[PDB]
Design a binder for this molecule. Structure first.
Ligand SMILES: [Mg+2]
Ligand SMILES: [Mg+2]
Ligand SMILES: [Mg+2]
Ligand SMILES: [Mg+2]
Ligand SMILES: [Mg+2]
Ligand SMILES: [Mg+2]
Ligand SMILES: [Mg+2]
Ligand SMILES: [Mg+2]
Ligand SMILES: [Mg+2]
Ligand SMILES: [Mg+2]
Ligand SMILES: [Mg+2]
Ligand SMILES: [Mg+2]
Ligand SMILES: [Mg+2]
Ligand SMILES: [Mg+2]
Ligand SMILES: [Mg+2]
Ligand SMILES: [Mg+2]
Ligand SMILES: [Mg+2]
Ligand SMILES: [Mg+2]
Ligand SMILES: [Mg+2]
Ligand SMILES: [Mg+2]
Ligand SMILES: [Mg+2]
Ligand SMILES: [Mg+2]
Ligand SMILES: [Mg+2]
Ligand SMILES: [Mg+2]
Ligand SMILES: [Mg+2]
Ligand SMILES: [Mg+2]
Ligand SMILES: [Mg+2]
Ligand SMILES: [Mg+2]
Ligand SMILES: [Mg+2]
Ligand SMILES: [Mg+2]
Ligand SMILES: [Mg+2]
Ligand SMILES: [Mg+2]
Ligand SMILES: [Mg+2]
Ligand SMILES: [Mg+2]
Lengths: 214, 37, 146, 177, 23
RNA sequence: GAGGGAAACAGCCCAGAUCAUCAGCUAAGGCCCCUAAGUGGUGACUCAGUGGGAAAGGAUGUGGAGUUGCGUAGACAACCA
RNA sequence: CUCGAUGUCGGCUCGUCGCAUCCUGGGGCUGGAGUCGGUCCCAAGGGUUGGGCUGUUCGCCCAUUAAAGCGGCACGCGAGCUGGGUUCAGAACGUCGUGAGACAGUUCGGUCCCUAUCCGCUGCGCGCGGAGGAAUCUUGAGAAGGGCUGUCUUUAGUACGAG
RNA sequence: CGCUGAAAGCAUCUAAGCGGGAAGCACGCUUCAAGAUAAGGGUUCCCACAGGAGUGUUCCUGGUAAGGUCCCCGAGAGAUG
């Protein structure tokens, strides 16, 4: 229902800048490269309004026949990635249209979505901030234990949703209201004030800020 | 408003009504407003 | 030896019921009876001999008293504080199919066969259904005197 | 229903269409419409009046009888004469002004002026910075609009400051005796 | 108690005739 | 002390299992669906989901039956002195 | 009910639920000048501090805070921890007993264990199905998380008030 | 807290109806999600193979297409998968 502008990019890393109030600002560098409209979704044929964007450099021998046919119908060269943008203005998008970082101006607030860095199987003390037990005073082989995990004969069970150890990281995380610092479209570079999820080289979705601003 | 199981006329101007299944006392004087509960 | 149906021996038909201004209880009892095939002399509890029921206009099911806002339906996700509750009026407005299926399932035996048979109930809140190919015949809820 | 059993006299220029359960009332001031509850019927009584009949002498029959009689009489008297309500404001610094027949601006001691829009059938009429009025063709709508205007700043029991009805008997006491 | 009250009130069912073990 | 009823439920209700039966009639309890048999017939009452837990006390809920005061010398409300 | 064993206080850890609401939200009556208050309703979304004393619960106190809620869950939680208290054998004091000894009197000291089978729960795979076999992008029935709050500035020394 | 308004000639937030009204309810925000066996939808690719039995072809073997896995080099991933 909401109209969203969007673009796809790659997390190149971070550096720092100084703003006009001489304030040090951390900036993430996103190679908000050229994206092409591979497919437009309409209520008539698909049931919702969204725009599928491409983006990515792919080797010709690593694109299969179904993907090649999809891109041939789109009328564009094959791209590595394909990500949709749920926008209510999908129609205004034509098949094969060119999208560049200049879709965002010098002070727009954006939401950046990416897959967070993985940590493997994490303990409770790390993946949930559990305070363990003391290091001394008789603590017996339970320094990083989760403590109790329930009650007693009532309910004689462990409630669903209890926080215990497990695999943390590698998940969809959206960080909101990041003010774009600068856009240089002729080389497809975006400087966004903040820290975005994911390791260097990961795919990032930069969309217009859902909550507009602070 | 006073919420009491026992609501009665206090003055001569108070009126007892049944509103939305509850017995209430309405009066020009706001002190006499009552509701069963 | 008493007769017993053989798998596909009993031919299953398609009925359509217009739930227009019909009480939910009567609609659900009729649907359960039809789905289980209790109106057939070939009935057998262990073999599905019932018919398919297509209910239309489920959004206009009649409710008596203050049921539309005081008769509640509960679901629990299985975790603490995982209860949701919604009134039958809201459920008929939003997802009438869920309401009709809940009523019919409650009125139907608690069986694997009953679970299978409940899939034969096709509930649509509007006046139109997509099963013209199956050619459902209209069914009128009636009573037999004395 | 002693109220209901009394007839309703249709005045000149008022068109009363009794299309079964649904009724139209045309007049010089506008148009109103209403549906009577089912166990109550309406007749013309020689086309010069209106009658409402309860089919039984139960409670809901009599109650809806009186209700429908009063409400039909209200719509006809509205379409033949309208509805008027006078609201007066007391307290220093309080003012009301008009940006048109359907737009009011109130300075009721707030931080900023407050804007009041009117519905289509509601028209305001201000004559004094401390007195104004609302008119319409629906008694219920006029009454609720006046109620909202009063709710903006209801009278107080200390210095009366607030929008009050013209005949409102506002209570009052004394704090710092 | 609620449990005791329900246990005592169970004797009012039709098939029982106003009596039930443990009241 | 099985069987039927009581949701489940040694002590309550019905009823005392010799075995077989793919016969019939009943008991308690039941007859919209779960669940076998009535969404039974006729006349009232309830609209609280009361039915399907509870007290002192409280209440212009609603139906019915009285007793009694006043009243077209004109009653009760509403409206002018 | 359990004596062919259902481990008993407080803290730690982890929560979850009730509302008989401590704060924050809304409203009546009072009021109450205002400022504040106090009381009868609503309301459980979130939040509800750190220390001194004592084994303590409780309680008192210090310094804060929007506030430092009350309760249930085997007085939640020892196959999660703690062993300071309690309730073993040592010893001492007081009291009692002729004495062995006794004391919900006091004091110092004082062993526990468990590689998780089943359910439960946090994660992660394999299989098969999804009426041909595939590749990509998805809808969301439904599920979970999140929901706190202060101070200052301004409106304005305005409203109110004799000040 | 109301508006209109009877039953009850008035009145009444209520009996018909309409409006306001909280950090609560449901959304809004974020995340998982078709084992949702109701197993969804769009787009794209591959194609009517071979040999036996057969009993409407059925079904069982065999080589493939699109595509995928094994194996190897790794990390932005990871206990092992
Ligand atoms: Mg630590
Ligand atoms: Mg250690
Ligand atoms: Mg258990
Ligand atoms: Mg008690
Ligand atoms: Mg015997
Ligand atoms: Mg027996
Ligand atoms: Mg029995
Ligand atoms: Mg039984
Ligand atoms: Mg018989
Ligand atoms: Mg009998
Ligand atoms: Mg059963
Ligand atoms: Mg009948
Ligand atoms: Mg009957
Ligand atoms: Mg009740
Ligand atoms: Mg009840
Ligand atoms: Mg009672
Ligand atoms: Mg044992
Ligand atoms: Mg409460
Ligand atoms: Mg809480
Ligand atoms: Mg809740
Ligand atoms: Mg103490
Ligand atoms: Mg607690
Ligand atoms: Mg305990
Ligand atoms: Mg334990
Ligand atoms: Mg010790
Ligand atoms: Mg011990
Ligand atoms: Mg000495
Ligand atoms: Mg001695
Ligand atoms: Mg000791
Ligand atoms: Mg272990
Ligand atoms: Mg959903
Ligand atoms: Mg599920
Ligand atoms: Mg009134
Ligand atoms: Mg009023």
């Amino acid at each position: 229902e909401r109209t969203v502008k969007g673009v796809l990019g790659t997390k190149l890393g971070m550096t720092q800048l100084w703003d006009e109030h001489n304030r040090l600002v951390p900036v993430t560098v996103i190679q908000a490269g050229p994206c092409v409209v591979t497919q437009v979704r309409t209520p008539e044929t698909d049931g919702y309004s969204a725009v599928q964007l491409g983006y990515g450099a792919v080797k010709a021998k690593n694109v299969t026949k179904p993907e090649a046919g999809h891109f041939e119908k789109a009328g564009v060269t094959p791209r590595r990635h394909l990500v949709e943008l749920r926008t209510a203005d999908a129609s205004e998008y034509t098949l094969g249209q060119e999208i560049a970082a200049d879709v965002f101006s010098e002070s727009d607030f954006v939401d950046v979505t990416g897959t967070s860095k993985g940590k493997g199987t994490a303990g409770v003390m790390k993946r949930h901030g559990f305070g363990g037990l003391r290091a001394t005073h008789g603590v017996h082989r339970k320094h990083r234990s989760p403590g109790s995990i329930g009650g007693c004969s009532t309910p004689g069970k462990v409630i669903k949703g209890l926080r215990m150890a497990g695999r943390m990281g590698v998940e969809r995380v959206t960080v909101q209201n990041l003010q774009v610092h600068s856009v240089d479209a002729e080389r497809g570079i975006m400087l966004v004030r903040g820290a975005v999820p994911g390791p260097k080289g990961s795919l990032l979705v930069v969309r217009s800020a859902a909550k507009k601003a602070a | 408003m006073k919420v009491q199981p026992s609501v009665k006329k206090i003055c001569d101007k108070c009126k007892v009504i049944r509103r939305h299944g509850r017995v209430m006392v309405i009066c020009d004087n706001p002190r006499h407003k009552q509701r069963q509960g | 030896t008493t007769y017993s149906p053989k798998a596909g021996e009993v031919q299953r038909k398609w009925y359509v019921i217009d739930a227009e201004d019909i009480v939910l209880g009567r609609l659900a009892t009729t649907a359960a009876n039809l789905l289980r095939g209790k109106h057939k002399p070939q009935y057998a509890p262990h073999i599905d001999t019932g018919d398919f029921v297509v209910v239309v206009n489920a959004s206009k099911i009649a409710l008596t008293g203050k049921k539309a806002t005081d008769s509640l339906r509960y679901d629990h996700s299985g975790r603490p504080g995982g209860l949701r509750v919604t009134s039958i009026g809201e459920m008929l407005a939003k997802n009438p199919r869920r309401a009709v299926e809940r009523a019919v399932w409650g009125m139907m035996p608690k069986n694997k066969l009953s679970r299978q048979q409940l899939k034969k109930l096709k509930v649509y809140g509007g006046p139109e259904h997509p099963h013209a190919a199956q050619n459902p015949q209209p069914y009128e809820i009636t009573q037999i005197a004395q | 229903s002693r109220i209901g059993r009394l007839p309703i006299a249709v005045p000149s220029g008022v068109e009363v269409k009794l299309d079964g359960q649904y009724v139209e009332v045309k007049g010089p001031k506008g148009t109103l419409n209403f549906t009577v509850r089912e166990p109550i019927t309406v007749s013309k009584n020689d086309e010069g009046a209106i009658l409402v009949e309860r089919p039984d002498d139960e409670r809901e029959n009599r109650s809806l009888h009186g209700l429908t009689r009063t409400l039909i009489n209200n719509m006809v008297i509205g379409v033949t004469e309208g509805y008027e309500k006078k609201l007066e404001i007391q307290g220093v610094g309080y003012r009301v002004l008009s940006k048109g027949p359907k737009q009011l601006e109130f300075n009721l001691g707030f931080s900023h002026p407050v804007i009041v829009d009117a519905p289509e059938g509601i028209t305001f009429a201000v004559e004094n910075p401390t007195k104004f009025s609302v008119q319409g063709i629906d008694k219920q709508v006029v009454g609720e609009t006046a109620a909202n205007i009063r709710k903006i700043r209801k009278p107080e029991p200390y210095k009366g400051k607030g929008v009050r009805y013209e005949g409102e008997n506002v209570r009052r006491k004394v704090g710092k005796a | 108690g609620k449990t005791g009250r329900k246990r005592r009130a169970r004797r009012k069912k039709g098939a029982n005739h106003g009596k039930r073990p443990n009241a």
